[PDB]
Amino acid sequence: EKQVEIRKKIEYSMQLNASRIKVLQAQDDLVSNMMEAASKEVLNVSRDHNSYKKLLKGLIVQSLLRLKEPAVLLRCRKDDHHLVESVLESAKEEYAQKLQVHPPEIIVHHNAHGPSCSGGVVVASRDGKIVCENTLDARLDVVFRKKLPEIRKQLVS
Amino acid sequence: EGTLEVAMEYRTVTGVAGPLVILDKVKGPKYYEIVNIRLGDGTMRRGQVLEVDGEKAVVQVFEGTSGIDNKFTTVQFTGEVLKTPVSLDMLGRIFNGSGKPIDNGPPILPEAYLDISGSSINPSERTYPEEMIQTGISTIDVMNSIARGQKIPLFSAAGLPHNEIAAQICRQAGLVKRGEEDNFAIVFAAMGVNMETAQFFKRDFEENGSMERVTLFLNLANDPTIERIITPRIALTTAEYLAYECGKHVLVILTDMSSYADALREVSAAREEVPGRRGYPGYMYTDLAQIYERAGRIEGRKGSITQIPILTMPNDDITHPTPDLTGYITEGQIYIDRQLQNRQIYPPINVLPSLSRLMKSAIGEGMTRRDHSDVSNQLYANYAIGKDVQAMKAVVGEEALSSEDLLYLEFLDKFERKFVAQGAYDSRNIFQSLDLAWTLLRIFPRELLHRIPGKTLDQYYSR
Amino acid sequence: YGYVRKVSGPVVIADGMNGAAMYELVRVGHDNLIGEIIRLEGDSATIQVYEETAGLMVNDPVLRTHKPLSVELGPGILGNIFDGIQRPLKTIAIRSGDVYIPRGVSVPALDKDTLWEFQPKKIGEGDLLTGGDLYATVFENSLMQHHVALPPDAMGKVTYVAPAGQYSLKDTVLELEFQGVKKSFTMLQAWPVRTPRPVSSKLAADTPLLTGQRVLDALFPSVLGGTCAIPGAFGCGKTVISQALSKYSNSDTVVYVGCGERGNEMAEVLMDFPQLTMTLPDGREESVMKRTTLVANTSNMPVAAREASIYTGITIAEYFRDMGYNVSMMADSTSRWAEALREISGRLAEMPADSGYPAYLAARLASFYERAGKVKCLGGPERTGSVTIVGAVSPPGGDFSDPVTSATLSIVQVFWGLDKKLAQRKHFPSVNWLISYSKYSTALESFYEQFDPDFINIRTKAREVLQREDDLNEIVQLVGKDALAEGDKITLETAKLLREDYLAQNAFTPYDKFCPFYKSVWMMRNIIHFYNLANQAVITYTLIKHRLGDLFYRLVSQKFEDPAEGEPALVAKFKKLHEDLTAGFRALE
Amino acid sequence: EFQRKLAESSGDSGANVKRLEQETEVKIHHLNAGAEKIQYDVVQMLLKHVTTVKN
- In whole angstroms, give the CA distance from residue C290 to residue C587: 55
Task: Please check whether residue D54 touches A, CB under 8 A.
Answer: yes
Q: CB-hemisphere CA count at 13 Å for C306?
A: 26
Cβ–Cβ below 8 Å for B225 and C363:
yes
Cβ–Cβ below 8 Å for C22 and B158:
no
Phi-psi region of B279 (alpha: psi -120 to 50; beta: other; left: phi over 0): left
Contacts of B209 in chain A (CB under 8 A): 9-10, 12-13
The beta strands (E) that lie in A2-156 are given as 71-73, 105-107, 121-122, 130-134
B363 alpha-carbon distance from chain centroid: 23
Residue C272, phi then psi, degrees to nearest 5: -75, -45
Which residues does C449 contact at the CB level (< 8 Å), separation at least 6?
C455, C456
Cβ–Cβ below 8 Å for A144 and D46:
yes
The beta strands (E) that lie in C95-195 are given as 115-120, 128-129, 136-139, 156-161, 165-168, 172-176, 183-186, 189-192
Cβ–Cβ below 8 Å for B4 and D54:
no
Cβ–Cβ below 8 Å for B4 and A24:
no
Cβ–Cβ below 8 Å for A58 and D53:
yes
Cβ–Cβ below 8 Å for A8 and D38:
no
Contacts of A146 in chain B (CB under 8 A): 4
| Size (chain B), residues | 463
Shortest alpha-carbon distance between residue C367 and chain B (Å): 5
Cβ–Cβ below 8 Å for A38 and D9:
no
Cβ–Cβ below 8 Å for A23 and D49:
no
Q: Give yes or no for a cis peptide into B106 (omega within 30° of 0).
A: no
Identify any residues that bridge with B333 across adjacent strands, giving them in sequence order. Answer: B355
Distance from the first to the final alpha carbon of chain D? 80
Nearest to C359 by CA among B156, B261, B227, B155: B261
Nearest to A68 among B7, B27, B206 (CB): B27
The answer to whether B143 touches B376, Cβ cutoff 8 Å, is yes
Q: How many CB atoms are closer than 10 A to CB C407?
A: 25
Shortest alpha-carbon distance between residue D24 and chain A (Å): 6
The answer to whether B392 touches B402, Cβ cutoff 8 Å, is no
Contacts of B42 in chain C (CB under 8 A): none
C468's enclosing H/E stretch is helix C455-478
Nearest to C195 by CA among B222, B267, B99, B195: B222
Task: Give SS3 for C170.
Answer: coil
Nearest to A143 by CA among A42, A15, A17, A19: A42
Cβ–Cβ below 8 Å for B109 and A31:
yes
Determine if residue C238 is labeled as part of a ligand binding site.
yes
Cβ–Cβ below 8 Å for A42 and D31:
no
C209's enclosing H/E stretch is strand C208-209
| Torsion from C-alpha of B399, B404, B406, B407, nearest 10 degrees | 170
Task: Give SS3 for B74.
Answer: strand
Task: Please check whether residue B109 touches D, CB under 8 A.
Answer: no
Task: Give SS3 for C329.
Answer: strand
| Torsion from C-alpha of A7, A10, A14, A15, nearest 10 degrees | 70
Determine if residue C237 is labeled as part of a ligand binding site.
yes
Q: What is the DSSP string of B100-120?
A: -B-SSSPPP--SS-EESSPPP
Shortest alpha-carbon distance between residue D11 and chain A (Å): 11
The answer to whether C519 touches C574, Cβ cutoff 8 Å, is yes
Contacts of B10 in chain A (CB under 8 A): 129-131
Task: List the strands of the sheet with B305-309, edge to edge.
Answer: B214-220, B186-193, B250-254, B305-309
Contacts of A8 in chain D (CB under 8 A): 9, 13
Nearest to A152 among B25, B107, B111 (CB): B111
Specify the DSSP class assigned to residue C105.
Answer: -
Chains D and A touch, contact meaning at least 3 pairs of CB atoms under 8 angstroms apart: yes
Specify the DSSP class assigned to residue B282.
Answer: T
Cβ–Cβ below 8 Å for C22 and B16:
yes
Q: What angle do CA A8, A12, A15 make, to 5 degrees?
A: 135
Which residues does D43 contact at the CB level (< 8 Å), separation at least 6?
A34, A37, A38, A41
Contacts of B4 in chain D (CB under 8 A): 49-50, 52
Task: List the strands of the sheet with C136-139, edge to edge.
Answer: C136-139, C115-120, C165-168
Cβ–Cβ below 8 Å for B89 and A24:
yes
Distance from the first to the final alpha carbon of chain B? 72
Nearest to C354 among B14, B195, B278 (CB): B278
Shortest alpha-carbon distance between residue A127 and chain D (Å): 26
Residues 1-55 of D with CB under 8 A from B: 49-50, 52-55
Determine if residue C461 is labeled as part of a ligand binding site.
no
Q: What is the CA radius of gyration of chain D?
A: 24
This structure's resolution (Å) is 4.3
The answer to whether C403 touches C356, Cβ cutoff 8 Å, is no
Nearest to C40 among B70, B220, B278 (CB): B70
The answer to whether C407 touches C341, Cβ cutoff 8 Å, is no
Determine if residue C232 is labeled as part of a ligand binding site.
yes
The answer to whether A61 touches A91, Cβ cutoff 8 Å, is yes
Q: What is the CA radius of gyration of chain C?
A: 28
B334 alpha-carbon distance from chain centroid: 12
Nearest to B6 among A10, A139, A148 (CB): A139
| Torsion from C-alpha of C416, C420, C422, C428, nearest 10 degrees | 80
Which residues does C265 contact at the CB level (< 8 Å), separation at least 6?
C236, C239, C258
Task: Give SS3 for B169.
Answer: helix
A124 alpha-carbon distance from chain centroid: 17
Contacts of D37 in chain A (CB under 8 A): none
C557's enclosing H/E stretch is helix C549-560
Specify the DSSP class assigned to residue B122.
Answer: P
The answer to whether B104 touches A26, Cβ cutoff 8 Å, is no
Nearest to C437 by CA among B163, B256, B342, B349: B342
Chains D and C touch, contact meaning at least 3 pairs of CB atoms under 8 angstroms apart: no
Specify the DSSP class assigned to residue C391.
Answer: P
